[model samples]
Target: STDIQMTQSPSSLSASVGDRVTITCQASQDISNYLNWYQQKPGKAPKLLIYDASNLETGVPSRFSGSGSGTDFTFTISSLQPEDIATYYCQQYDNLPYTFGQGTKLEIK
Candidate 1:
């Protein structure tokens, strides 16, 4: 099967408040701007953070940013906050069936 897998580095992260964190997502093939970032907490559903690789979702926050295209992409939180504590995921919507990364969970100290 020709599946485009999304592999994210560092399954988990230990950070502190006010610190900046960056997460990377590598696609199995060229996916262009079809990559999107999301944040999810326990019980609640995952919410979109960035769309089309580099565009921030509406009314999210200026601290969050995304970059890159095709096979390589990154998601960054300029400054980590209490509310920012959650698992961040990357998804590729380029193919017929969407693919999601294993996710990077954040643990704030």
Candidate 2:
């Protein structure tokens, strides 16, 4: 099966300034670093955070990072801020029928 499975631990997180939050994703097969991370807010399109595994997107803050390989991956927010409140997702583009994680909602705590 080409289906990729992605999940965020906790599904939701209470965040504050300077807090670190980590979300994870898993694929059914080797994606060869073809994974991407996104951040989405209600009423807006999802913003690309990391691409090709651990590479940060241009203009994205350093606080947001990603690391992992093969069947497992992790996206981390090194320092959470009030403006960072949003849902995060992990996506795989290594094969056809791209899929995304259910999403992790971050809220100010």
Candidate 3:
């Protein structure tokens, strides 16, 4: 345990299709842009959506984006889609053993 803590708000969210949605993640300390966002569906592997604070994974949809640095980070969906409903994890890789936020579930409203 590196004593690194990740806080992701709103354990679950409900947003309408085509609406903007965002989830914020906060690290206990400055992480130097080592935060990443992963989208995970039930019974499936996590998909790397955003890395190093703001880089989108290739082939990922344009609607998904990440922004922020150091201790505060945010994951955003420019326009929520029906298929975008899933649980998201904020991963911290700037320290030993890596750390991750519990998860935030987004559902279609």
Candidate 4:
């Protein structure tokens, strides 16, 4: 299978509590809903936020959401929080040799 490509927009941003933010991901081809979103703090493992496109992972706050189909996807944070300062990544599991987007860094401002 061909390798998948992923991209995240606005590489970085300054955000604060209650402020909404969105991160977008585009894949090289149709991936259906085989996409996942993750958040990572410096020196820590990434935490899965959304899986299979729009489904929020268990235990994650409702403020974090996802939406998309085919080759495009979106991750949104309805109300940014102090602890949300971190890097976000989008990954594709549609094919072998999974791919991840160049991380998007979130800053508190």
Candidate 5:
């Protein structure tokens, strides 16, 4: 069983000042790079942008941005670090049903 369908466009529950939110990942296979992007802010726990796509999981920081590649992927946060808002997921260890891509929550209006 493989199912990973996520789409985001102007899906910002609410965001003021310089609004810029985007998240999209549609993959049922071909996760070659084994995507990985996370950022949680509301208790703290998740904070890893890009894993095998652009690579940047060492003390996560620097605006966080993981470019796209095989199967289609993109995790960006150029300028929105007010605690990074919240919810934003995309993980696929390249094996097992270990996949996640159904989150995009940011609030701050």
Candidate 6:
């Protein structure tokens, strides 16, 4: 597995309902706009966030959004839902060497 570097400002280990958090990933170089996001809950499969950076996959709630360009990208969940309490992962699909961030887990505090 390859490693991807991710960064978040005002790091949030926990959040209340309705808070918006932004997670960003920076690629080593331009990997096109081929990126995807996933929502993973404990003991459950991950749900796709956005594909191709800004395109929301079918069935994903409007609360989730992603956008960026070149080597930089961001994932945003407008209003945190109760079921949104889980880890978020960003992935790249531009090449065979696709990769995902370590992931950011959420908890209620």
* TM-score against native, each model: 0.97, 0.93, 0.95, 0.96, 0.30, 0.85
lDDT of candidates 1 onward, in order: 0.93, 0.87, 0.92, 0.93, 0.71, 0.77
lDDT of 4 at 75: 94
lDDT of 3 by residue, 1-107 (tens): 45789999878999899999889999998898999999999999989999999998999998999999999999999999989989999999988878889999999
- At residue 106, candidate 5 shows an lDDT of 85
Q: Write the per-residue lDDT of candidate 5 for residues 7-108, one digit (tens) a residue.
A: 433345566645555576766677777788787777888777678867888877766767777678877666664666888788777777676776788887
Residues 4-103, candidate 2: write the lDDT tens digits. Answer: 6666566888977889998988877888899999999999999999999899999999998999989889999998988889999989998778888888
Question: What are the clash counts of all predictions, listed in order?
Answer: 0, 0, 0, 0, 0, 0
lDDT of 4: 0.93
Checking candidate 1 for backbone clashes, the offending pairs are none
Which pairs clash in the backbone of model 6?
Answer: none
On residues 1-109, what C-alpha lDDT tens digit does candidate 6 reach at each position? 3444444332346877898877887776576788888888889887887999899899989888988977888888888778888888887777666677778878766
What's the lDDT of the predicted structure labeled candidate 5? 0.71
Error of 3 at 45 (Å): 1.4
- Model 3's alpha-carbon lDDT is 0.92
Cα lDDT tens digits for candidate 4, 45-92: 999999999998999999999999998899999999998899999999
Off by over 4 Å in 6: 1-12
The stretch of ten residues in a row with the least summed lDDT in candidate 1 is: 1-10
Q: Which ten residues in a row have the lowest lDDT in candidate 4?
A: 1-10
TM accuracy, model 5: 0.30
